[PDB]
Amino acid sequence: AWKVSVDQDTCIGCAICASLCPDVFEMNDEGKAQPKVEVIEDEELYNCAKEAMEACPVSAITIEEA
Template identity: 35%
Template structure:
């Protein structure tokens, strides 16, 4: 089981591309104009992905003006 989980509340995304600019290995803009977490799975209206190393996702979450990106470590929200 992965140590970290990254998620995005897509309905809150304002398409600013901050996450894409900071962490392009994990984030891209989808065809609908909103941020997409590469390799993620849908969970309702949101997307989630388990990862072993948080890498730049904490910076992406902290830079998000809509506060719609979340990072969890062992099930506990850290951002």
């Protein structure tokens, strides 16, 4: 499994992460992304969030093995 987090202050709110992997990232009240759950257990859902991570224009998303 992997821990997933978005740096709110660093996120610029473009939402490509939520467009690429809505199963992990959603946009909140304040226009920033956040993960729906702080962990991902399935591999291909990991692949889904990793693509979103790698397309972040400011590297606000981090995914690390738990």
